[model samples]
Target: SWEVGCGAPVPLVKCDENSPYRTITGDCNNRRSPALGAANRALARWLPAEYEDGLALPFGWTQRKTRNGFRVPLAREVSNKIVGYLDEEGVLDQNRSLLFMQWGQIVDHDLDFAPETELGSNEHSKTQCEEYCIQGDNCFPIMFPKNDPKLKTQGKCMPFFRAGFVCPTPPYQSLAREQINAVTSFLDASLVYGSEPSLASRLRNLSSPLGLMAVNQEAWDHGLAYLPFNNKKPSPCEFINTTARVPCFLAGDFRASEQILLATAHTLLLREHNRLARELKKLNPHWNGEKLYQEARKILGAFIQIITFRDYLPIVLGSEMQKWIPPYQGYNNSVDPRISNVFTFAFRFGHMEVPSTVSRLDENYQPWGPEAELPLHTLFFNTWRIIKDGGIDPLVRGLLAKKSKLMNQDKMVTSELRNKLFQPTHKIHGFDLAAINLQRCRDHGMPGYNSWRGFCGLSQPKTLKGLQTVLKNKILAKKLMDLYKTPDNIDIWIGGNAEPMVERGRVGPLLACLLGRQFQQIRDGDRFWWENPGVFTEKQRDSLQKVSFSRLICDNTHITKVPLHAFQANNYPHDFVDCSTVDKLDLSPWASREN
Candidate 1:
């Protein structure tokens, strides 16, 4: 009973049995039909490139058969236009150039083999290869020359884009502009005071404190340590052999990929900052060189440090307030630029460095000392304090105040009411705390009563129901309990807590908390959450040996199992050995002695 035009006046001729226009002639007299046609015509004018044509007639009669009929071609054209626009605008051109170079390497190396060919090159190999390449998302392969010795070189051997190849997308020029503008606005707002000259001069003399801390922490967290007692170290020969035989020997490709991504992100940010600085200079032509330099420095510093308001707020107002107000809001509430400046300094100096070592404990050891621990918290907090002490510029202060006010408004809170609503915990201790207790149990010798007591802290019998009450009543006991419940969260919490808790005075405890978390994550193999599979697993173990590992590593279809695309163009020999009998098959004619 649900007719096509049930709610409206029907057309004289119906377009389909189901459509109201199925029986309509060349022109209809009905006002409703004419009005509908006019609406359709107007919509077609405003529709996107692909949808400019009216909706399809029944039975696909008006459907375009070509793959590039509308959407595909339009997307290609749009992508090219965007690239051209950015190039003309001088935005993210450096990163784009770098990416182009990297992509060229991939394209030139004949690394883009068809998926079918990659699996095994026997039957229907060419078709299989094309299908495989097509199946891959955002990946293409390169073709090798006939003279190249690395490839099989037999059959219909044309290289194509491989399945797992990830080509970099061009940087968003508009987003870069926005970032620059935002950073510039922040700098301008902060400079209401006359301290711009002094700030700029000081900033030039200072190195990034955050960068140093991050690097140091990375080193310490990943530093060299003894393996557990029973953990066997591979013999030098075996190690060399393994390295030579693996597809990603030395993990060079993986590292390269990650570095490319990092470099891209860094370059984009820098370009944005530069653009913003140039624009600001134009806006304030009367400002002296020294003042302009200072403003530029402030903007760059803030841009580097305040990656997000999320990281800035807790550092400024303490972590306790972070729960009540999100980071952006907390930043807005703070009137000083000290928080932003300190954060910037810390990121530049501390957060950007690479660690010196990264090894796991051997199976034999249960207990670990400071030698086994990476002092990440010490590194982060120390760097943060140093950067903060370096000095604050005025621009950072004003931006913080504005942001805090915006965040604190009742209207913003009301809009996010649904997100804020949640059911209250029944157990009071909460799941996070409970998980922390379990972790503490695993860390401290896995003891029975001690572990149990450390886990829930409820083992104390007379303690309050919730963590907040327990923490407020007894600081030391509460800390220990909190550490037991969520040891990893402790370092971050301490780093952002009140002045007395985070300043130089409280550095030792904070360092200890950070070290503890690092130790727990590393020694207990929890760092696997962040690292690639090969980094943590045994060198001799093949993923194919374990069903779970195989499943994780392989595609749903077993044929496309190996990640050949990750291999460098010439580095395959270093990662894996060629064990085929064909290599040893001597076909020399001068083997008369064998007869």
Candidate 2:
């Protein structure tokens, strides 16, 4: 029996009218007066009218409940309103059926990571053995099943687990600590601080002696837990778990280091290219907007393609180049042996139309000769001849015209006889004809003089009235001879030979070196090494040289600009930095330590 302090029996109130008192002690604790217990009764009730008396009670009276369950009244009224709305919408049903309709229809949902059952002791029922699997720095979301046999048989209605920031086992403790340090360091140093000054200052203020001590104590109490789940996981189809763990679970700090390196390299390369272009414009004051644009475009295009190949050599060559090789072989066997099977195939079949006429002619003519066979001169002569002829074979004429337009025209040819003589010859030979005529045009005048020996094949003109008459040829020949005799004209042709190569060399090699170095650094940092063969193989490089020669000879009538990669490969040692000038940190430990 419960003991009452300092008394044999508790004082009782009498329920007698003559005594002028009614007994209230026993019923006082059991039954609530309307003023005191109306809120509790209203809370227990399910609907609007049922809870109205409590809602009508004054605030002071509502707070007088022995249990202090004042909010229960408001909650019951809200729930009733929601139920009434559902009823209006024809969805009102018994609680069991409603619960089944809402949750049971989700037949398939992930629940493999759900909580397991444990024994509940005493009335309180807490288990020390119930441990949580925390998300680590590199870990993925743990999927759980709803109908886990352990949970289902135990009569558990709702199965869920605490997913984030749980303590890992002993072996992972060191790694988890390191990650926390790294995250803390990054947060402390990053631009996020400046961007969110208040938050950053708060965090900074909290990381001091007293705050840290408090935090450390709390952290220790929780054990060596992993970092909080920052990234959110995708939601399940029908069911919702507010405490669901994030999918992008990372185990260590170095998870994003590779990505960061790659991004840095890409950004640096773009910046360097733009800088180079700007520098080039400053150096060459005479270059017009179109000229500068074309040069920049060519350099940019080549740089980007080479860098892309450098980064993704295996994927691009294996997939993209392989698709092209079969058709290339077919065309190779069918075409003339002299014609480059790969170039023609790449041009015709691959549908990557040659962007510039210079590239096309350089590919066609460089195989034949050096500076004497200037493709640019031949290109110009052929184009002028085609334009002079009125719209005949317009497509062919347009092609020649475009090629001529691309050639640097600051240098000009003064010999009109050389031009007229080559017009018919170029018409017959196409690109090949202009190349031959360039070498012989100075020796022969147009249509020959009185003797048939003056110019080849044009001395014996059949009609004087035709456009190809010998008199017109003779007059053009005289005019060309007069121009050729000028000292300035002769000097101009001779000086133009080395200029384009010199200009190209200055920018091209520098650009390639910068891009290559940056890309190597990026890959090295990411541990991205290429095991496959290079994109530009020995055979392909050789083929490129031949194409370069052919195009140079055909278009410019000369070969001056060698491919910069080949030049660097042939001339320079693999890695030849000056040892005496090398930084101590830059050198390997073996070299530095030994010294």
Candidate 3:
């Protein structure tokens, strides 16, 4: 039996019982770990829906079931492999840039982070974990359908597990697997906010608040990870592994060492924190350390939202459907910005787009040669190389100057990502990202593709032929049909990504629908969304509107030239512009009157 909280659902707002989704923020959980009413005021608490022991989806999804109106599809390693094949066969737009992958990862961190919970967690080895699928004593493993004959454990279903916190499940129920409690505040800024209270207090440097602590740049110049580990470089940073030296950046997510782009994303934000702290101090010399820090954090949150919704979102959602995201009219006390499951599930498709190498470009639209392209595998957990390589300028220059693999049609997995994801020290062949993605969706017990299609209120197909409408090709449809016995049993992760494109957007209609609603909810539900009235004065908002990715890179990195819209790799009006022309935020609006 699950532990009962013995508390009633506290209402953050008065709403109809029939409401399809949360319209206001904080309504879901005013219980135990309530929103701080501080930096996280715009987020929803992980209430877990008091009725379902906080494990079931709130609003209308609670009442629904799978596509056949029965059981959810069982997770299978084979299921992961089928999609892996599809990912390997195609390409949408020829080439993709590191920024494309970095954007998705950075945004992903904003929406979700599994909470810290020592309770009911399990541990086991890859050897013993094989037989127990989704079983407790071990993690849900990532299985490679084909094994390397030379490597003894090659084809085995081994637990290549990362630390994850699961929400409460009753009587060992599988339902809770899909709804594991997300710990980080769903609001954009909480990544630095210390999800718990006394947070603004914790991140302090204690000296003069010139910047947030590096959290511990001390232990690591950093070292790390992936594909047989032969890619290892004896570098400045080495982590204190359990026994041997495990050199890697101790980041908010353990996977930080997974790739340099992920590390660079953190680098940008960490620097963004320091840059703003100084700006806030310069703007208001009289403000105390705490005040400057708090306000700086708040301002950072606001800018993040501005960059994400205003600058970044349009690139992903496209201009027309980007219209779906509502303007920040004002702080919608009623808006509930909890991250949704569908958002996480479909967004994982971003992994398939991870390119083969990290490119370093010079100021003049060309490669820097030796620095120009580093194998993606060689760069994992090896962060200090950027400093050793030539700093962030080359990396940022590379990002804006490059284009990402088009995430449309059969063009999903890049060969490096599929075959050599995390090259490790043993020189064993690397793991498959496509397999991990498929397994993650299933491990979460996400209802199958048709189940999600039904959840979206779209028409459900009963047969393989009907599946063509969603699957694009008859062979793919027949393959899924053969694998799953019924269309309703198909996995949503594979099914959703396989759909035809949205009119002008790269994501299919199904994903666009899912992303559209989730995006709308965050906007409608966020009380501190950048455009919300009063978060900033009219002048500040206008100044914020002027800020762009290009400006951010110009200000922070060595790059002095970039496209007007850094997100777009190349196009009209996106020509390389001098850093002088980039938009910059004005701190003067935040200034206070002098005595």
- Candidate numbers, best lDDT first, in rank order: 3, 1, 2
Q: Residue 531 error for model 2, in Å? A: 27
State the weakest 10-residue window (summed lDDT) of model 1.
175-184
C-alpha lDDT of residue 154 in model 2: 29
- TM-score of decoy 3: 0.77
Candidate 1 lDDT over residue span 67-94, tens digit each: 2122111211211221111111111111
As for TM-score, the candidate ahead, 2 or 3, is 3
| Candidate 3 lDDT trough over 10 residues, lowest sum | 221-230
Model 3: CA > 4 A from native: 1-81, 85-97, 115-136, 142-155, 160-178, 181-185, 196-203, 211-246, 250-254, 319-323, 423-429, 571-574
Ranking by TM-score: 3, 1, 2
- Name the lDDT value of residue 229 in candidate 1: 13
lDDT by residue (tens digit), candidate 2, 1-595:
4222121122232233232111111112112121111100111111121111322211111334411222222211211121111111211211111111111111000000111122223422222212232322222112122433323432221112121111221222211110001111010111111112233233221332221101112111112111111132231100111242212111112121111111112222222233333544565545444434333333332333232333222221233322222221111111111111111111110011111122122323222223312232233223222122221122211222221111121212211111111221112111111112211111111111222111112232222232123223443333323323221121111111211211222111211222222223222221101211232334433332222111211222122222222212111123222223221111011111212
Per-prediction TM-score, please? 0.18, 0.16, 0.77
Give me the overall lDDT of model 1.
Answer: 0.21
* lDDT: worst 10-residue window of model 2: 105-114
The TM-score leader among the candidates is 3
Q: Candidate 3's residue-wise lDDT over 111-218, tens digit each?
A: 665432233225334334444534343244553334432136554544444333233222334334333323343445555444433433444467654545344433
State the RMSD for candidate 1.
33.9
> lDDT scores for all predictions?
0.21, 0.20, 0.55
